[PDB]
Enzyme design. Sequence first.
Site, PDB file in Angstrom:
ATOM      1  N   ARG E  87       0.998  -1.350  -0.060  1.00 39.99           N
ATOM      2  CA  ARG E  87      -0.105   0.045  -0.041  1.00 39.99           C
ATOM      3  C   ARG E  87       1.036   1.116  -0.231  1.00 39.99           C
ATOM      4  NH1 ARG E  87      -2.087   4.139  -0.906  1.00 39.99           N
ATOM      5  NH2 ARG E  87      -3.796   5.183   0.215  1.00 39.99           N
ATOM      6  N   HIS E  90       2.087   7.021   1.277  1.00 43.61           N
ATOM      7  CA  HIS E  90       0.762   8.050   1.305  1.00 43.61           C
ATOM      8  C   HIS E  90       0.655   8.977   2.754  1.00 43.61           C
ATOM      9  CE1 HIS E  90      -1.223   4.801   3.257  1.00 43.61           C
ATOM     10  NE2 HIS E  90      -2.210   5.759   3.567  1.00 43.61           N
ATOM     11  N   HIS E  92      -2.343  11.640   4.880  1.00 47.79           N
ATOM     12  CA  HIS E  92      -3.967  12.150   4.767  1.00 47.79           C
ATOM     13  C   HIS E  92      -4.023  13.116   5.794  1.00 47.79           C
ATOM     14  CE1 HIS E  92      -4.222   8.223   6.546  1.00 47.79           C
ATOM     15  NE2 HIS E  92      -4.123   7.476   5.518  1.00 47.79           N
ATOM     16  N   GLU E  96      -5.357   7.880  11.524  1.00 43.53           N
ATOM     17  CA  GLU E  96      -5.687   6.444  10.981  1.00 43.53           C
ATOM     18  C   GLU E  96      -5.416   5.340  12.256  1.00 43.53           C
ATOM     19  OE1 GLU E  96      -4.017   5.089   7.127  1.00 43.53           O
ATOM     20  OE2 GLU E  96      -3.587   3.259   8.124  1.00 43.53           O
ATOM     21  N   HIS E 135       3.092   7.402   5.622  1.00 39.12           N
ATOM     22  CA  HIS E 135       3.199   5.876   6.092  1.00 39.12           C
ATOM     23  C   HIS E 135       2.979   5.058   5.020  1.00 39.12           C
ATOM     24  CE1 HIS E 135      -0.912   7.393   7.021  1.00 39.12           C
ATOM     25  NE2 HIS E 135      -1.262   6.209   6.598  1.00 39.12           N
ATOM     26  N   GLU E 157     -11.353   7.418   0.569  1.00 40.53           N
ATOM     27  CA  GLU E 157     -10.294   6.340   0.189  1.00 40.53           C
ATOM     28  C   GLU E 157      -9.503   6.568  -1.071  1.00 40.53           C
ATOM     29  OE1 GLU E 157      -8.042   4.698   1.756  1.00 40.53           O
ATOM     30  OE2 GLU E 157      -7.229   3.086   0.356  1.00 40.53           O
ATOM     31  N   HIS E 268     -25.423  -0.588  29.124  1.00 41.68           N
ATOM     32  CA  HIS E 268     -24.571   0.723  29.552  1.00 41.68           C
ATOM     33  C   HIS E 268     -24.579   1.915  28.389  1.00 41.68           C
ATOM     34  CE1 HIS E 268     -22.309  -1.287  25.998  1.00 41.68           C
ATOM     35  NE2 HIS E 268     -21.555  -0.171  26.028  1.00 41.68           N
ATOM     36  N   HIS E 270     -21.978   5.404  26.909  1.00 41.91           N
ATOM     37  CA  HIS E 270     -20.760   6.130  26.874  1.00 41.91           C
ATOM     38  C   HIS E 270     -21.022   7.633  27.167  1.00 41.91           C
ATOM     39  CE1 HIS E 270     -18.741   2.537  25.892  1.00 41.91           C
ATOM     40  NE2 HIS E 270     -19.772   2.179  25.009  1.00 41.91           N
ATOM     41  N   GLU E 275     -20.063   5.893  19.608  1.00 47.04           N
ATOM     42  CA  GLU E 275     -19.374   4.542  19.489  1.00 47.04           C
ATOM     43  C   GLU E 275     -19.485   4.218  18.058  1.00 47.04           C
ATOM     44  OE1 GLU E 275     -20.211   1.322  22.194  1.00 47.04           O
ATOM     45  OE2 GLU E 275     -20.298   0.025  20.688  1.00 47.04           O
ATOM     46  N   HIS E 314     -27.563   0.965  25.563  1.00 42.30           N
ATOM     47  CA  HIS E 314     -27.540   0.095  24.510  1.00 42.30           C
ATOM     48  C   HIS E 314     -26.933  -1.276  25.149  1.00 42.30           C
ATOM     49  CE1 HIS E 314     -23.679   2.156  24.181  1.00 42.30           C
ATOM     50  NE2 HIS E 314     -23.089   1.036  23.520  1.00 42.30           N
TER      51      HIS E 314
HETATM   52 MN   LIG Z   1      -3.245   5.604   5.479  1.00 45.76          MN
HETATM   53 MN   LIG Z   2     -20.857   0.588  23.955  1.00 47.64          MN
END
Ligand SMILES: [Mn+2]
Ligand SMILES: [Mn+2]
EC number: 4.1.1.2
Lengths: 377, 377, 377, 377, 377
Positions: E87, E90, E92, E96, E135, E157, E268, E270, E275, E314
């Site tokens: 890959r 590159h 961005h 990531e 990277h 992408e 629970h 957050h 999420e 959730h």
């Molecule tokens: Mn990348």
């Molecule tokens: Mn969760």
Amino acid sequence: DIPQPIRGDKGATVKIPRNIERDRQNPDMLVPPETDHGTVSNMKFSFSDTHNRLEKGGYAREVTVRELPISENLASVNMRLKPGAIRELHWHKEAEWAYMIYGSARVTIVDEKGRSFIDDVGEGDLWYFPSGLPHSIQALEEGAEFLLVFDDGSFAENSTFQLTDWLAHTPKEVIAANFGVTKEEISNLPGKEKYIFENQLPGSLKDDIVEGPNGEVPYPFTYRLLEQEPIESEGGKVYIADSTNFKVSKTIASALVTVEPGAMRELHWHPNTHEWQYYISGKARMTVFASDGHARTFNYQAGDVGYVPFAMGHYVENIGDEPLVFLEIFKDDHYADVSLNQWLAMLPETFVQAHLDLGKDFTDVLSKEKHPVVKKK
Amino acid sequence: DIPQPIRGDKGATVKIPRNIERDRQNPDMLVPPETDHGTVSNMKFSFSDTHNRLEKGGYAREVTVRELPISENLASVNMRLKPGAIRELHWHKEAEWAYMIYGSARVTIVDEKGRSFIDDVGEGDLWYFPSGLPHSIQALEEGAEFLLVFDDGSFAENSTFQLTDWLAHTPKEVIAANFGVTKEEISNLPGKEKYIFENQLPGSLKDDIVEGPNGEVPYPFTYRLLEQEPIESEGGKVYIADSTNFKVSKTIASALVTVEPGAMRELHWHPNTHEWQYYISGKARMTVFASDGHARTFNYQAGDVGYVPFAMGHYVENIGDEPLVFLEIFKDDHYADVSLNQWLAMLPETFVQAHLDLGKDFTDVLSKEKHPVVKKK
Amino acid sequence: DIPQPIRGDKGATVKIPRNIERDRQNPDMLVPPETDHGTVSNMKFSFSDTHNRLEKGGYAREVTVRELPISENLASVNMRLKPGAIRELHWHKEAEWAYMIYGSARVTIVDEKGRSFIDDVGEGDLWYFPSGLPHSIQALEEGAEFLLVFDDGSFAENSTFQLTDWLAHTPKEVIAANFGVTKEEISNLPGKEKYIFENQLPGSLKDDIVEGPNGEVPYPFTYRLLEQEPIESEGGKVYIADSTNFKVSKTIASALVTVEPGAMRELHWHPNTHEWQYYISGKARMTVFASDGHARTFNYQAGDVGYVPFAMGHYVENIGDEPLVFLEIFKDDHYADVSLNQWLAMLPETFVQAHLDLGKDFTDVLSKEKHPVVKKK
Amino acid sequence: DIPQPIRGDKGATVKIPRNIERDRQNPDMLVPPETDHGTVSNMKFSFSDTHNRLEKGGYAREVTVRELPISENLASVNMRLKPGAIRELHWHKEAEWAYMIYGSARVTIVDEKGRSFIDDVGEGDLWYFPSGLPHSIQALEEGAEFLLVFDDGSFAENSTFQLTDWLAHTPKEVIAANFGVTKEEISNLPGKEKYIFENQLPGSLKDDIVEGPNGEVPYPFTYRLLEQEPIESEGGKVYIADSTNFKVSKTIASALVTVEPGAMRELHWHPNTHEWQYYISGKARMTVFASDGHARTFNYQAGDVGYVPFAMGHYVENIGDEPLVFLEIFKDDHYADVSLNQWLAMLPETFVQAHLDLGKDFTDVLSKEKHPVVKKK
Amino acid sequence: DIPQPIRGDKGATVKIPRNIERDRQNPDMLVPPETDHGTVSNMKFSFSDTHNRLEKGGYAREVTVRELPISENLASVNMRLKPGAIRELHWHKEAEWAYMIYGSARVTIVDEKGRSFIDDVGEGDLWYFPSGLPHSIQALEEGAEFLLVFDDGSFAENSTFQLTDWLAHTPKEVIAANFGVTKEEISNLPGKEKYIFENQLPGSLKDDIVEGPNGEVPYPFTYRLLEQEPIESEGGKVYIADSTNFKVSKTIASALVTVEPGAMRELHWHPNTHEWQYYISGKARMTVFASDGHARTFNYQAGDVGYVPFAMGHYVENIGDEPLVFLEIFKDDHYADVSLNQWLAMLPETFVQAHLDLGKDFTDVLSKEKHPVVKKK
Ligand SMILES: [Mn+2]
Ligand SMILES: [Mn+2]
Ligand SMILES: [Mn+2]
Ligand SMILES: [Mn+2]
Ligand SMILES: [Mn+2]
Ligand SMILES: [Mn+2]
Ligand SMILES: [Mn+2]
Ligand SMILES: [Mn+2]
Ligand SMILES: [Mn+2]
Ligand SMILES: [Mn+2]
């Protein structure tokens, strides 16, 4: 008597049907200072002009961005609880700051490490609950009435997450699996939210304290504001609570201001962010100076919300015969102001004179110490 | 007496300092119907709660999207002129609709083909000026007070284009070249806008009429609303002006509604667009039904602006001992309503009964003719 | 010589490195009229300040909302074709209006009923292609250079739909099925767009005309603007093309304005929509009056795009020794203007005098007939 | 077998846990044509991937902008009713278009003049209800299953205005006053919405027809699409309904397309607006060509929603052994397409050859008549 | 068999053509719990429903805000590399985060001080690359398949910055000047991006390590998640990586959750942020509780992306006979949850009983210790 929108040779009598009670409450809006100019957004809204949600155990009414569109970052609820009555265990996305105007209440909060904090809050005390941490309020023997501020103007009081509403919309088989119980053991769960409900008075605070394996919370979620030493000046007092003294209060900085009759919160601005105001008692006027020759004066009295956008110049003058008491609220980790008086006092006197076309007789009165509230001579 | 937010066993007495005059004006907000539910935007704002611009010759105050954020498409000015006084020759992007509440006035308008229209307007008369066409208002011997509606909620009254402000910010050499005159001949031009100014009363309308090479305007810019035959029903009267009868009025449809004591504007909605309201006199309540079990009741009296978003169900009930008189305003080329009563009357009776769990004794009262205003029995 | 930003006792010499050539081109920006005031958006941009896309057969460069952010509704391409060269068969979402400045070209268009139109276009001629209808341009023996206007400011010239780009990104098996041919029969299709390509000159127009089963198009997509009779006034000429005469041109109204040396396009505004401008030749200045005491003057010369937002007052003065020639473009179905002169001429003279603090000697010069272009005396 | 994302020497076997059933349904997404390129928004969503609202009497599930964010202007409900069951009297802001896939139903509508229309709708029939006009659906003896399209992508099926929900949130004293009845006479009104409810089958249509003082509606709200003569071509049939034939259908244009095995909806685009698709039966692929060398292929089968933004090139190929049947829906007052084949057929042959690097053997196959659906050779 | 949307006496059989394979995968969507209510956004999307980009050396497919519009802050790529395949180097704008599901790979990164880090990553290992740091990824002898998460939902992408694409669009004379070489020396540079390309396997990691004058990076960009000690509870395991342990991972917090058959991730929420979920293996259902009586249940299996907006309640229940393994991802500097069980355990028991209308037999089961994954009894 009958006020008229007339200032010297400007304006005219009202000739159509009109609201005289409102005109009487807004003398500086019906007859603005001649120094006002240009379009300025509305910076004023009354809780009396909102729908009041009535429940068994009390009430809740709100001023949001839907009522006061200038205030996009901060919203507010005036909530009332009868003795013993409970504001249901709940949580929301917004951090919550509170000021107890009347009565007292027990609050609970459990943090994300499973540590609990339970405390009683009296008149002049604050709480702050960080975003997403679950909490409750239960009024004690006097009942309770308090002002809440949430750090999003789009807040909708009817749209908070309630314990029983969560369970009413979770499959019974899942709730049963979650707790290791049978469906029959939880068949009595409420079918809908409670929100506010009547309940017997709690016992002593010391009997409610819950011990756990996870420790004490590192910082308290309540603060005794009126037990602090205020900044004292000639015409009143300022009590400040922000993240530097009320440690948990990271997104809300606050000051309680008292202004004696014949006094004013001086000409100043805030170099950090917008100010949201609540008038607890008394009667005020404030001119908001919006730059580029724009300025607009507003009247406020008990039950009103006010607003001053970021860095706009302002003062708050007491225009009644009783003390003026109001809150200044900021979505920030600190309180800060720039005093017009102190600013100029800290500059070379000839430079100030060159700006103001005034002489030594003026620059001689300036003070290098900040007095937030000044008394008329 | 002292109203309290208490409904049976729900609510509680107010324990903090409060605005009793406002609470008294809003009985259905302090104590809402039990049938109200959920978050609904504010649909209510008073002209009394706005800054009043005072000038030599009268005043102007406005309710815009900055005061009432639900009303994004429509904004309003309450303007007052003393006898003879002139609202300066000006134009704006927005179309302008007006209702003359008090007095009378002379208007001028010149269209984009250089055709002029000059006319006198009395109590109950309308004008409509299309977007961008230049116009003036001069009050006659009684003075004038009128309500203006502009078809953009972001309208800013202070930001209209004024004749003299245009010339004050155009180079003198250019103005002189434009007209074929010397700079000395125009040296007396004003240095700033006039906006509203005192002036001697004009002469008879017939003496002001200007003849030109370009013809008469194809359609008049004024309309005598109260000279029309209203829809008459038991509890009041409705006068409608939209583009089908007041031809130039392409972006504003309007109705003046009178509701007798003990009467109501029936349960209905508008299938075309949002309704903006102005309460001329009397006292009302209205419930706005927002779907999904949301409904909120508002109080209105003289000087109030109201709003009903597109298709929301509503009624307007007179809750005082005098006639209730209000305007319903729509940004559209036509007025339209759907009557709840007539809708159901026009369906098979067993189908209606199947919906309402009610029988023949109910479907028997329905009427196939629409009665916009109904009287209590 | 070396211009300096100095006007009487205001301004100062430039002390840092500077662009003297640009300063010389903008005398009314380096030294604005004293009557200019306040923040006004940029209304000026040069094609010379854009990237020029060079191809075998010519070039294309554009001014869009990315260059001139005030112009959100209208964008423009300056395109050049060499003799015979083809702007590839293509379509886009935007309607396209064009003015042929130099040379001539053959255009094709096929409408949604499969009817075709093929025509030759010379200097001063227009075309208009409705949104989404496919078209081509082929320059004749002189080559061609023309100005295109698209009715979306977000237009991106590099992002149009091209015939060969469509086919290059469609499966060969699908193209073959679409036409009833084998994959081998279409193996020579281009692998990528052509966009602009060199080609042999076409033959006579009459030999290209394609007959079909579907009829002639109801309205032509070209218009001979300069063959029309212009509005003639003392200092120049105005040729108007909108949907009332150039029938297909529903979203673009246009006027070509010629202004002699010592003349000006008079003080006026447009009551319908924003004006987008292209300066074909000469040198101009224009003051844009933005209301509320805001006005800003801009300089323009050949290759410049100009803009006047909806209803803002303006004039365009020739400040050179050659004719000034520019286009006024509107996203609307009609051209309309309000002349300051004609407006005031059509009002009672005492009313105008009361506004301007000027007398009969001024109102006597006003004209009831509109003269778009006036000559200095 | 087990499909792998491998195309010649490109791609690789899937090495992580995967959804093989979905991979099998999407052969042209797991292994796209080599001619696909660049980022293209998702244009594909299944009703099977939505929450289904189950009621006594049937169900409703929806694909909105919340599921398919490219489709901002159009949203859809798949609704099912059991025999006799009623979709409650209701209205909404959005216009509603429908196609009856299975069964039959009785609809009612009352317009804003109090005129009613009641009609039975069978397989292949349409209805259209203009925005804000109140309506109902009752399935007949077979039950009914139909596709609804609303002309706003933000539509929320749960948020429509229901008769009984309106009354449940209106004060009883107001409902009683509205109809001239006592509160006791309406005490049996439902406490909450019904939405969908079981009911006895209705009688004959002729017995339900309601006569009124206001006349017959000027245009019917139903249309028998499959009774029309379709455009017939080699590989299938197209039935079009827009405002030119189905008069009331002002905001929705529609076509039902049938494509035989081995056939395709030809390469075309729509010059007016975006296309929204529903796949009734069969299996398809479509490449969406997005300009600037962007193209992406999607698979569709029964229950899928598709989308083609404004003017993007496309085809719809049948890739199964049964007929492919789908709807093309447009928010516009008319259907229009541009056929790639017919476009090129209507241009000079040498000009087309110059574009495609192909000769007479290709331009000879082009047809001047449009064939929307073509059969493979 | 053939599932039907029927729950007791609610719903009905599907009567139109349908997708039975999808219906079978979504049992809790075709037949939701009776406790589900109201409009909730789609929280579910399959990688199988996306276009797969195939290259020599592997593939890449993505789920972005264009597929799943609720997820505006986080986007994801499923990337596959064959043995040795690269890959391309590159960078961005987005940070990531990665999880290695299959195989192994060598990564390189160079920071803004010119310090390099090169490391091998195996199944269960993570990497995090801060925004804008360049990277590469090269698969080792087994190939590699991994999940990438980028901290912007608008990620595309196809639109990353590639080394060779940079050089292909930089003037040769500039590249030559940059490096002190001749244009002839760089004439072999690629004409276009590589993106993913086949390459020979690299040698041992120790031979690739590059030494420099600038030092070692202060913190590693890889993390061995599965080598950590997980939180262990009855029904499974949770491994957490956020900025408190994986130091560089400032904008992404993560947890790998394993849930045994018959177990569930407990009820629970957050308190910090939304999420984002990826289902590695197994089959789950989750109810998202959205407040105000809104809740919607979703099904997930391997290849699915899930989402839970900020603070929504959730659980994630395993509904298959194999382990359920999924990732919980947060755009934040820390992981945090509030356990429903632990919250209530930490409150006075009578207060909890007063809320739930349940007694000691219930509050006795609550646990003061958090067990993220619980086993059914
Ligand atoms: Mn990348
Ligand atoms: Mn969760
Ligand atoms: Mn709270
Ligand atoms: Mn302040
Ligand atoms: Mn006006
Ligand atoms: Mn109404
Ligand atoms: Mn074009
Ligand atoms: Mn102009
Ligand atoms: Mn409907
Ligand atoms: Mn199509």
